Design goal:
This is part of a larger assembly, with two copies of chain A. With 728 residues, chain A is of the alpha/beta class. In chain A, a hairpin with a 2-residue loop joins strand 12 and strand 13. Chain B: It catalyses: ATP + H2O = ADP + phosphate + H(+).
């Protein structure tokens, strides 16, 4: 249907007037990447913009910003027409003025702060119907053009004289503000937007089709995640972005109201928003109003949760609605709300990663001006547990640390301030380092699921067991073609066992990095404290959080501490078991081989373990991690100092010889002392940097075999037969 | 609806609940269906305050105080038989029970076809495979798996059509289909997350699926097949069938399979309760769900009830050296009170299995509980072919192999460790093929390399220990 029909999509780049396409559309287009284009759009309102080319788009799709996409009165997923035409020319007048409340409280000269610096060397097209936004000085400014050089197009040149009175504008009746949230105000969530985006999209954009079909569009959604994670943000974003009518319910709000006042208040919310459909209904803190465990005292609270049910279930299809609620943990809410015809969908919005945090940090760092020494790629690596709302108050508190010490000397106090200071005001790296050091980065910290940073090169030796792990994880994900042809079935779990400090934890994080699978780590002590006094109930959740993360490596680390809890050494009269070992391996038997979740245990004392976990179908492949030998003992040293400035004098072949029964962790203990003996001489020297050969000679003096000899023969005995361990 | 009438104001419900019978008294013959009887009649520690305790006693006086009225029948629904006031199950109240379980694959295919009727499908679809890939699924899961797969089709198909108007006509829909790539996609989302709990089914395993063991196969059909087949006999000669069996032997020698084989043979349902799962529901110092697995066994008869890896429980109390006391828990006792409960006129049939007969409680060996003891030995050469011959029956082995030759070099391998050889061989084959992308057929050299790393799973010095218990495990009670 011709290359006059294009679709809307949301840009990767942040720049104001551009559109990004691909070469197939270019081999359809045959026009430049520096050209101007005049686009046609809905409601007789159209606008002028330029194009470039790039791979991130598909064969056919169109990247835009909101500032473009709003004037065109279009939304993501609308048919647009680029109209590839070269009308190219300069314009003349281009008289602009600021917008109603967007300048409220800021005053003064706008030429050198705003406007001018935005146009320079990047002449930007303009039309009588372009509103645009300029970022700076802690503020988002909005503009409009009542007249310019006559239409359609005007293209600035590094001359053109712009003239502006200032003063507000009349607020446009229907024209949205750009300060309303949209898919660009959310970051780190990319994967769960597209999930929410598909699922809610077409029944909002295409109310008719469903009325034409017998398909039931899912209507109800539950968003998980700990507080401050952006649940309420993601909700309103979608409602704005999709065009829907967004009504909002607070839990406390309707539990604040008088008994019997809530019922009419909760009922009206649907009844009213029934009339305005298509409609979103968002319920903040569903936990407040529907808390069924031992639930509540007295009817009036037990009554309102049954009112909610008869609205969800007793929804007859009404006309058209979709309900969205939010809560901190999936639990604590009445189970009867998750049945079908009620909130059947679930979207778990976890904490962000560093790649997510940098995405967030840039969003709250946009509008403000920064010094050149800032990094923000390092910050994301120094903020560990942080949700989005922590990481926003880390930007706004760092920026108040800047404007206290800067303008206390200016000490100017009046009704409003103008932009020159703000423009010549910046935040430095010393502030971020300061606001990161307060207790504000105190933040919620719980089970994290991520792709690990460790690579294969980060571990030395072990080259064959590296080859065997990729057999057992890489391939069944890579080649589902095979394993049908030859039949059989992949084995699910693995068990590493060996001397302490020999590399088991690392080698589990390496394959996750290799297959880009998520990695969940559950350490024996942590697992056994949540059992607390005689109760846990959270184990089934780490298998859930593993299930919705697939492909996933699920790693049970230092699995020996649990068995020695029941008892170690001499031993009890009984075997080594707890009620938290049993509910693990009921749940292993639960997960299907069609799942690509993959389990790995590790133990430093194979002597003690429960045979139940070695049974075929639980942890079958047994892998014995030996101590390193000379040629590998170089690989270890060669590795962990890869970031250390070692001097040329050293012989790593020589270290590796004098050492024999050292663990890989104890080699790092030598390399550790050497480096800390170096810094003592340097610090002395303040009354030259490099690591020196003599240093390694002194460190090597105090080195310590971490594993005894007489216990090496014990690993060598279990290396042979650990299969025998079950049955007697 | 339960919530409906619990939504209404206090005292509004009474008149609302009463009218439902009073009205539908006038329109008889009449059904009265009560959704979620759990909402309105939850008596355990039951409730707070009268108004909720009042409405459950209003319901009772309607059920019991039904005088025969004219003509009515009441139907209610609930998730678990428990949680509802016991006083509602007395006679003149809901005395009937119909347990509607989860479906089987034969059931799921039946469902899938019902929500797949009206829609058009591509020819590559199967639906007999889907039913085998959807494991825990209830009907409502398996319906939203059809409607979400069919939305995956009409998003990518008509987004290019991008036609938006008041109504659409049928040509597209007719020329619109769903493919197998969609089902595979919607099956891969987390929507197939579904409730998964004790399943009762006829097992897929056959006799041919296990090699060797030809006499103990003959003895199991004596003990299960015949009293169901020939109730004529067992009267003529008198006596009585024995109820339970106990398999014991080295690990990996085929006990679990051989229990699922007879269930398949007599087309009896099969319930499996594994030692760990049984001992975690005891949770902290409480279970209350054991009597239910004997109920779910009772209403399923003819039923094989299989207690698998029954050793993990006894080693819980303690294994090896041992405690000062015997191996027991409060979850062993409430099993064998309940075994003594079920009558020989029931055709429910119990089977245990253990890898450590040394440790077990003698109480379960008493005549009238688990009487027939059967010792499952390790395979021998002629049987070790039958095992290999079996588990690769679906594998494309090349003609070069000698299965007679494998079986010789192996002696004390378990049947499960033979599969461990046959397992490695097949995974060493796929490595060469995957290399070869920069020919399919298992090769003789492959089995020669796999055989290199093979591992005796059972020690020699513990084989003489099974041979000693093989002789006398009856002696174990009394000292
Ligand atoms: N092959 C190796 N390559 C690099 N570092 C190693 C290696 N083996 C041990 N290490 C060091 O040991 C530390 C982590 O040890 P792990 O890989 O967890 O071994 P582990 O025995 O599973 O753990 P523990 O705590 O020593 S019992 C790392 O900081 C490494 O410096
Ligand atoms: N006679 C046999 N025929 C076929 N497969 C067998 C046989 N014996 C053992 N196996 C293999 O062992 C696996 C299941 O073993 P089971 O029959 O459960 O023996 P078990 O000793 O009761 O169970 P475990 O886990 O080995 S203690 C199957 O996957 C089979 O491949
Ligand atoms: N993914 C994200 N991207 C950008 N900002 C975020 C994100 N997540 C959280 N925030 C910040 O969190 C703050 C409030 O979050 P909120 O919507 O209240 O989350 P919740 O409702 O889950 O508590 C907002 O200021 C927003 O800046
Ligand atoms: Mg470790
Ligand atoms: Mg078994």
């Amino acid at each position: 249907n011709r290359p006059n029909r294009l679709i809307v999509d949301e840009a990767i780049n942040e720049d104001n007037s551009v559109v990004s396409l691909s070469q197939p559309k270019m081999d359809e287009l045959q026009l430049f990447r520096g050209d101007t284009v005049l686009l046609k759009g809905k409601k007789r309102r159209e606008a002028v913009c330029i194009v470039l080319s790039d791979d991130t788009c598909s064969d056919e799709k169109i990247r835009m910003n909101r500032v473009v996409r709003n004037n065109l009165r279009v939304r993501l997923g609308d048919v647009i027409s680029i109209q590839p035409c070269p009308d190219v020319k300069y314009g003349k007048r281009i008289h602009v003025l600021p917008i109603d409340d967007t300048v409220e409280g800021i005053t003064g000269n706008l030429f050198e702060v705003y406007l001018k610096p935005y146009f320079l060397e990047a002449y930007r097209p303009i039309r009588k119907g372009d509103i645009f936004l300029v970022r700076g000085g802690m503020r988002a400014v909005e503009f409009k053009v009542v007249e310019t050089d006559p239409s359609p197009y005007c293209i600035v040149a590094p001359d053109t004289v712009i003239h502006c009175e200032g003063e507000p504008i009349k607020r446009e009746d229907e024209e949205e503000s750009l300060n309303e949230v949209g898919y660009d105000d959310i970051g780190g969530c990319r994967k769960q937007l597209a999930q929410i985006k598909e699922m809610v999209e077409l029944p909002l954009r295409h109310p008719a089709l469903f009325k034409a079909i017998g398909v039931k569009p899912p209507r109800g959604i539950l968003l998980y995640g700990p507080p401050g994670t952006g649940k309420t943000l993601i909700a309103r974003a979608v409602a704005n972005e999709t065009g829907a009518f967004f009504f909002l319910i607070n839990g406390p709000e309707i539990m604040s109201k008088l008994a019997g006042e809530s019922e009419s208040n909760l009922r009206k919310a649907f009844e009213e928003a029934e009339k305005n459909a298509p409609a979103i209904i968002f319920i903040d803190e569903l936990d407040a109003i529907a808390p069924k465990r031992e639930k509540t005292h007295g009817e009036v609270e037990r009554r309102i949760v049954s009112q909610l049910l008869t609205l969800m279930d007793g929804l007859k299809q009404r006309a058209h609605v979709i309900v969205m609620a939010a809560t901190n943990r999936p639990n604590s809410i009445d189970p009867a709300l998750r049945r079908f015809g009620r909130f059947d969908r679930e979207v778990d919005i976890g904490i962000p990663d560093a790649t997510g945090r940098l995405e967030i940090l840039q969003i709250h760092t946009k509008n403000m001006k920064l010094a050149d020494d800032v990094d923000l790629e390092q910050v994301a690596n120094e903020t560990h547990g942080h949700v989005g709302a922590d990481l926003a108050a880390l930007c706004s508190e760092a920026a108040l640390q800047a404007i206290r010490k800067k303008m206390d000397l200016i000490d100017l106090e009046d009704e409003t301030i103008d932009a020159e200071v703000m423009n010549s005001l910046a935040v430095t790296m010393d502030d971020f380092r300061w606001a990161l050091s307060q207790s504000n980065p105190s933040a919620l910290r719980e089970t994290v699921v991520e792709v690990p940073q460790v690579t294969w090169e980060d571990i030395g030796g072990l080259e064959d067991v590296k080859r065997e792990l990729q057999e057992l994880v890489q391939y069944p994900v890579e080649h589902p073609d095979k394993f049908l042809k030859f039949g059989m079935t992949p084995s699910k779990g693995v068990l590493f066992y060996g001397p302490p400090g020999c590399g088991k934890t690392l080698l589990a994080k390496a394959i996750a990095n290799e297959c880009q699978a998520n990695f969940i780590s559950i350490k024996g002590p942590e697992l056994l404290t949540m059992w607390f006094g005689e109760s846990e109930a959270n184990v089934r959740e780490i298998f859930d959080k593993a299930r919705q993360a697939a492909p996933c490596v699920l790693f049970f680390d230092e699995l020996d501490s649990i068995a020695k809890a029941r008892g170690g050494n001499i031993g009890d009269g009984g075997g080594a078991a707890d009620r938290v070992i049993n509910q693990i391996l009921t749940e292993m038997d639960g997960m299907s081989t069609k799942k690509n979740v993959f389990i790995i245990g590790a133990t430093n004392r194979p002597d003690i373990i429960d045979p139940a976990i070695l049974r075929p179908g639980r942890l079958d492949q047994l892998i014995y991690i030996p101590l390193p030998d000379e040629k590998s003992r170089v690989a270890i040293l060669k590795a962990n100092l890869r970031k250390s400035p070692v001097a040329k004098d050293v012989d790593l072949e020589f270290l590796a010889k004098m050492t024999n029964g050292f663990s890989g962790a104890d080699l790092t203990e030598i390399c550790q002392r050497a480096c800390k003996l170096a810094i003592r001489e340097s610090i002395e020297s303040e009354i030259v940097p490099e690591i020196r050969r003599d240093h390694f000679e002194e460190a090597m003096r105090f080195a310590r075999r971490s594993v005894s000899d007489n216990d090496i023969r014990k690993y060598e005995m279990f290396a042979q037969t650990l299969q025998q361990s079950r049955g007697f």
